[PDB]
């Protein structure tokens, strides 16, 4: 699809068996999801942006379905105000910015 | 252009006669630039990023070039890790996300 930016580019994702809404975010290096359980090992990380930093759990090799497209990669889990699909997964679905 | 996302989508902007680097950020509603002088009056605004809310200075109807495209719109000035071009100006340059 071609998604315009008049509104937030929100899509449906499936992660850990759960359906969520998330933002397709070219400004995010990595994918960040609101607190949930995921299987396997994790390690702590701090990530920062406007307003400062938050502590997250870094889970590697996690599958997400993004608008119907399967991708695998790292997912950070923590107290983000919005679920964010970052570049690490946007690349896997072939997403581009065009103008 | 068609910009892939393996790297940060950094572009050159021109504001106030100065060249700066900025990030094309589809997860940002608004355009946020580091401290600089801009003409005219400003209004207060609070924005909520990943780590919390901050105060910024809102300047309306500012001339800004983005990757060679002309925009005139709202620029927020305040402490951000990098200059970010949000959807308010991404729409003016005709940007869409595609996959
Ligand atoms: C500031 C950027 C360089 C990095 N951000 C991605 C942005 O699109 C970030 C995504 C986001 C975060 C919280 C709430 C809503 C959206 N938008 C952002 O700050 O936009 C600001 C905040 C205001 C609400 C959204 O638009 C307004 C302008 S981020 O801090 O969320 C981030 C930082 C580290 C990682 C890990 O790589 C992922 C995301
Ligand atoms: Cl990854
Ligand atoms: Cl590619
Ligand atoms: Cl605007
Ligand atoms: Na894992
Ligand atoms: Na103004």
Swiss-Prot record, chains A, B:
Subunit structure comment from the entry: Homodimer, whose active site consists of two apposed aspartic acid residues.
Gene symbol here is: gag-pol
Instruction: Specify first residue, last residue and whole-protein length for the fragment.
Output: 501 to 599 of 1447
Name this protein carries in UniProt: Protease
**Region Dimerization of protease: start-end pairs:** 1-5, 49-55, 88-99
Superkingdom assignment:
Viruses
- Function text: Aspartyl protease that mediates proteolytic cleavages of Gag and Gag-Pol polyproteins during or shortly after the release of the virion from the plasma membrane. Cleavages take place as an ordered, step-wise cascade to yield mature proteins. This process is called maturation. Displays maximal activity during the budding process just prior to particle release from the cell. Also cleaves Nef and Vif, probably concomitantly with viral structural proteins on maturation of virus particles. Hydrolyzes host EIF4GI and PABP1 in order to shut off the capped cellular mRNA translation.
The record's active-site residues are 25 (for protease activity)
In this chain the Peptidase A2 domain maps to 20-89
The organism of origin for this protein: Human immunodeficiency virus type 1 group M subtype B (isolate BH10) (HIV-1)
